[PDB]
Amino acid sequence: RWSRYIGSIHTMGFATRPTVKPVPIGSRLGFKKSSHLVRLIDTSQDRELGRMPEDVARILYPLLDYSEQVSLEPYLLINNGKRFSVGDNIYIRIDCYLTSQAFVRIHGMDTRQLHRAGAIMALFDAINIQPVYGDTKNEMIPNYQENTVSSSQFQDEALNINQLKSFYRITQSAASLQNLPETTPDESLFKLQLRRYQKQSLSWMLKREYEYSHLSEKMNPLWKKFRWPSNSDCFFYANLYTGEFSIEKPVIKTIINGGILADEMGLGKTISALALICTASYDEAHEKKIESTDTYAYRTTLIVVPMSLLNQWQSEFEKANKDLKKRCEIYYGNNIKDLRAYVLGPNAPSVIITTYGIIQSEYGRTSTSGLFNVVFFRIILDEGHTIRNRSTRTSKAVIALRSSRKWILTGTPIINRLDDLFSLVQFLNLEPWSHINYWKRYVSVPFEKGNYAQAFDVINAVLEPVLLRRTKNMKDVDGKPLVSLPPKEVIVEKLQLSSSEKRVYQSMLEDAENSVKEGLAKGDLLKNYTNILVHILRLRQVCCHLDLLKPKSSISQDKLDALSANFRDIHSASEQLPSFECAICTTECIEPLSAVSITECLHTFCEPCLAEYIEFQQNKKLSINCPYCRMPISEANVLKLKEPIDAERGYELISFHSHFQSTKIKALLRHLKQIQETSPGEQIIVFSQFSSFLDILEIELRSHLPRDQVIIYKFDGRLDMKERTRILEQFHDKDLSCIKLLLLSLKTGGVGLNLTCASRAFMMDPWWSPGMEDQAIDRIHRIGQQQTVKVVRFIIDNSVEEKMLRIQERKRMLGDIVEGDEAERRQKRIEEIQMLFQ
Ligand SMILES: [Hg+2]
Ligand SMILES: [Hg+2]
Ligand SMILES: [Hg+2]
């Protein structure tokens, strides 16, 4: 035990009790603890003398609780040789000492610990003691107290795209990261070729797991160094954030296993994670411990991944893994009966891939089968910004997962709020920042009160040792960008027509071929040139959508989800089995459940009873109304329960009749549903030459995609200029919470339309000229762009569209307009038709 002085405070006090004999100048005063009123007493008279000012009482009052930790010895400064009157000023010098009972003495007690760390921090501000810096440019300042540091210009927790690009500009702009060593995995266990940056992330990820056995022979930003005073060793160290002090320099190494791998999309995060698994797939230290002399899955790596990427991960693992001894399986649909026994058993798989929705579903119903009665070896979250909402069942589920090593693979750790990082920290369990009180007191509140640079330094301080972030725009040591971004990548995706679509396309081909046989049997093929191109056009329309030749349900998937929610709310589980009445025959219990017919307004019928009503009302051509409440019920809006009934989900309302989706719209939706989780905020452009096809696409896309995650913009081309630019205005509005689609016509192209924000293009149909399609795509990419423009061309296999592509290939070889008289032009007209029908 010892004591030591660190600073003094000079302040006047207001007299409370008069003094008969004036107090000595060097009076050894004291502080008694009882808008805050801390009392100033003396040691001789044992009476009260004064009340301190408010701004000084706020500093003294909480410090008196830590008496053994920080003692305050106030001395008297001026004696006017007079009895203290009622209101005289008491000039005091408060000598502040530090006792070893605070120094190096380090149940949900965050409030007790922050109150100390804060009162101590306010004490330092009063005595105006500052740390020592040792670099050429000075680092961060001490974080200030509550309702201080010039709090002004209140800012919301939600972030601007400008505000967000400023956050990245500091965490991705760490020190030189181009000198990270390259770890190359041997081809005995891994059959892919990592890039230069991928070998760096592997070495860093192995370093983060402290796997030094796979490296080739390869302080404390929050703490700061203070200096003792010398009036009334020469250094000490402290962390004002937690109130912890240490006589020696605390070089506490990194503690958590793993980290966050944030990288711009296109740097191969998935491949780097796989290289990590193929290098270290089990806890070697645990294996030796158990045999040299339980719920730990010391050999299994759990990968939680979006649903739309569940099969790609299984695929990419098989394409990369060479060691057959380590197996990889997908946990989905309760396929593994006792997963707890599986991952702990002798045949434990090395990798298990599953969905957040599976993690969410098993957390809610208290699934003791697995995933939560087992501590995994390594958890890897792909697109980890899913858990960014602290209050959703999915986040609570992920945070409940236990593992020795944790990884977060996300290209965008912050979507639209600063505290999206908190759950990333809460997952990694970074004490004390996993605790919410530590986060809201040192990051949230200072940010919410406009002192944002203060919060960004704290954020950048905790994530720097744990987060690694590289950018495709970064330069290597040789002088090259990490990724050579081409202007565009165009890919032809061949599709095959549905069973119904082929029968239509084959019928239209007869009329096309028959018209060729007519003109050819009349001595001149061009005599039916106009009549031929008509049938060729109809074939082209059949490829896009059959409705382009000449009832549709009026309920979107968002509405069905809402109707299903209400239906499960009306018919809730209870002691007895679930039963459904019928509005026509008053049957208390409809059997079977597949015979239940539910109207647009959620009223239950027997499927024959409702059908009999509709047939009877349609045979008399009378407006259809619900037999129960007399509301407009459309026949296409009749609903039924999905068969079978999912026990984990409940009743699901699907359309009674089925509706037709063309092969191309089915394929586009297949892409879009995957881009949502692949890359947040992306602007996609959808080209088609047929305007009515764009009208169909708008209706189908908005019906099959959630509104809060996919926003559809369609350029009517028949609107005033201010609205058209207002559409582009909202289309260039980058929103990482959704993806934006611009449906515009290939005919007009992008003439006078800025389309630079687009990262992806979808060509829904080909045209006679390659120039028009090329010109539309070429107005999206501009040199000096962050992302290459990914283009997909949907072409119906063995159809006219495949033929038109061959015509374009001809034009590119010769030209679009190679002039010539009507003698040379007939040959081109004939050859084009031959190329269409061969
Ligand atoms: Hg019925
Ligand atoms: Hg009804
Ligand atoms: Hg050809």
Q: How many CB atoms lie within 10 A of CB 549?
A: 10
Handedness of CA 383, 386, 387, 390 (dihedral sign): positive
Per CATH, domain 557-569+579-655 is 3.40.50.10610:
no
Mark residue 774 as left, alpha or beta (left: phi above 0; alpha: psi -120 to 50; beta: remaining). alpha
* Ligand 1 midpoint to CA 105 (Å): 77
* Ligand 1 midpoint to CA 593 (Å): 12
Spatial separation of the C-alpha atoms in residues 224 and 832, rounded to whole Å = 78
* Ligand 1 midpoint to CA 363 (Å): 39
Spatial separation of the C-alpha atoms in residues 141 and 18, rounded to whole Å = 44
| Tokens of residue 34, six digits | 């009882």
* Ligand 1 midpoint to CA 590 (Å): 7
| Ligand-binding site membership of 270 (annotated) | yes
Residues 6 or more apart in contact with residue 810 via CB below 8 angstroms: 835
* Ligand 2 midpoint to CA 35 (Å): 62
- Residues bordering ligand 2, an ion, CB closer than 5 Å: 601, 603, 626, 628-629
Burial (CB count <10 Å: 0-12, 13-18, 19+), residue 463: buried
| Tokens of residue 541, six digits | 């329309």
| Tokens of residue 458, six digits | 């704290």
* Ligand 3 midpoint to CA 805 (Å): 9
Burial (CB count <10 Å: 0-12, 13-18, 19+), residue 222: middle
Handedness of CA 304, 308, 311, 313 (dihedral sign): negative
Residues 6 or more apart in contact with residue 472 via CB below 8 angstroms: 264, 266, 267, 481, 482, 483, 485, 786, 787
Spatial separation of the C-alpha atoms in residues 674 and 308, rounded to whole Å = 5
| Ligand-binding site membership of 723 (annotated) | no
The amino acid at residue 643 is E
* Ligand 2 midpoint to CA 599 (Å): 7
| Tokens of residue 357, six digits | 């929705």
Spatial separation of the C-alpha atoms in residues 752 and 72, rounded to whole Å = 73
DSSP 386: G
Name the residue ranges covered by the structural domains of the chain: 1-139+219-254, 161-210+257-470, 495-548, 557-569+579-655, 663-837
Q: Are strands 604-606 and 467-470 parallel, antiparallel or unpaired?
A: unpaired
| Ligand-binding site membership of 384 (annotated) | no
* Ligand 1 midpoint to CA 656 (Å): 16
How would CATH label the architecture of 161-210+257-470?
Answer: 3-Layer(aba) Sandwich (3.40)
| Strand order across the beta sheet in which 403-409 lies | 328-330, 351-355, 301-305, 376-382, 403-409, 258-263, 467-470
| Ligand-binding site membership of 135 (annotated) | no
* Ligand 2 midpoint to CA 647 (Å): 27
* Ligand 3 midpoint to CA 820 (Å): 21
Spatial separation of the C-alpha atoms in residues 577 and 391, rounded to whole Å = 33
| Strand order across the beta sheet in which 683-688 lies | 488-495, 789-796, 758-763, 683-688, 739-745, 710-714
Residues 6 or more apart in contact with residue 185 via CB below 8 angstroms: 194, 202, 275, 278, 279
E strands, 33-157, where? 39-41, 48-51, 70-76, 89-99
* Ligand 1 midpoint to CA 595 (Å): 9
Q: Locate all alpha helices (DSSP H) within 128-176, ordered by sequence.
A: 161-171
* Ligand 1 midpoint to CA 585 (Å): 5
* Ligand 3 midpoint to CA 827 (Å): 14
Q: Are strands 653-655 and 683-688 parallel, antiparallel or unpaired?
A: unpaired
What's the per-residue H, E or C state across 581-608?
A: CCCCCCCCCCCCHHHEEECCCCCEEEHH
Any bridge partners for residue 263, and if so which?
470
Q: Are strands 789-796 and 488-495 parallel, antiparallel or unpaired?
A: parallel
First to last CA, the chain: 99
HSE-up of residue 155 (Cα within 13 Å, Cβ side): 21
| Ligand-binding site membership of 511 (annotated) | no
Among the bound ligands, name the one nearest to the CA of residue 639: 2
Say if residues 664 and 492 touch (Cβ distance below 8 Å).
no
Question: How many degrees, rounded to 5, is the angle at CA 241 between CA 235 and CA 244?
Answer: 50
Burial (CB count <10 Å: 0-12, 13-18, 19+), residue 493: middle
Nearest by Cα to 380 from 275, 254, 253: 275
The amino acid at residue 751 is V
Among the bound ligands, name the one nearest to the CA of residue 581: 1
Spatial separation of the C-alpha atoms in residues 617 and 638, rounded to whole Å = 15
Among the bound ligands, name the one nearest to the CA of residue 605: 1
Handedness of CA 439, 440, 445, 448 (dihedral sign): positive
* Ligand 1 midpoint to CA 601 (Å): 17
Nearest by Cα to 151 from 605, 454, 478: 454
Spatial separation of the C-alpha atoms in residues 362 and 371, rounded to whole Å = 8
Q: How many angstroms separate the Cα of 669 from the Cα of each of 126, 136, 657, 666, 710? A: 62, 55, 21, 5, 11
* Ligand 2 midpoint to CA 703 (Å): 23
Among the bound ligands, name the one nearest to the CA of residue 803: 3
| Listed resolution, Å | 3.3
Buried b (16+ CB within 10 A) or exposed e, 100-119: ebbbeeeeeeeeebbebbbb
| Ligand-binding site membership of 171 (annotated) | no
* Ligand 2 midpoint to CA 625 (Å): 8
Among the bound ligands, name the one nearest to the CA of residue 627: 2
Question: How many degrees, rounded to 5, is the angle at CA 530 between CA 528 and CA 532?
Answer: 65
Breaks (C-N over 2.5 A) in the chain follow: 34, 106, 218, 232, 293, 550
The amino acid at residue 394 is T
Among the bound ligands, name the one nearest to the CA of residue 608: 1
* Ligand 2 midpoint to CA 569 (Å): 17
| Ligand-binding site membership of 265 (annotated) | yes
Among the bound ligands, name the one nearest to the CA of residue 833: 3
| Tokens of residue 91, six digits | 């000039």
DSSP 704: H
Q: Does residue 394 sit in helix, strand or coil?
A: helix
Nearest by Cα to 172 from 407, 482, 441: 482
Q: Estimate the crossing angle of helix 529-544 against helix 499-521, to 10 degrees.
A: 170
| Ligand-binding site membership of 242 (annotated) | no
* Ligand 3 midpoint to CA 838 (Å): 8
Residues 6 or more apart in contact with residue 296 via CB below 8 angstroms: 283, 286, 344, 374, 375, 377, 404
Domains 161-210+257-470 and 557-569+579-655 agree in fold: no
Chain centroid, CA 76 distance in Å = 60
Tokens 């299994």, located at residue: 300
Options 3.90.1010.10, 3.30.300.10, 3.40.50.720, 3.40.50.300; CATH of 663-837:
3.40.50.300
* Ligand 1 midpoint to CA 574 (Å): 24
Spatial separation of the C-alpha atoms in residues 599 and 605, rounded to whole Å = 8
Among the bound ligands, name the one nearest to the CA of residue 630: 2
Among the bound ligands, name the one nearest to the CA of residue 628: 2
* Ligand 2 midpoint to CA 633 (Å): 8
Residues 6 or more apart in contact with residue 336 via CB below 8 angstroms: 329, 342, 370
Q: Phi and psi at residue 455, in whole multiples of 5°? A: -70, -35
Nearest by Cα to 611 from 645, 643, 589, 585: 585
Chain centroid, CA 56 distance in Å = 46
Residues 6 or more apart in contact with residue 495 via CB below 8 angstroms: 663, 664, 667, 794, 795, 796, 797
Tokens 């010109």, located at residue: 775
Spatial separation of the C-alpha atoms in residues 63 and 12, rounded to whole Å = 19
Nearest by Cα to 89 from 186, 13, 11: 13
Among the bound ligands, name the one nearest to the CA of residue 596: 1
Q: Does residue 627 sit in helix, strand or coil?
A: coil
Rg (CA), the chain: 36
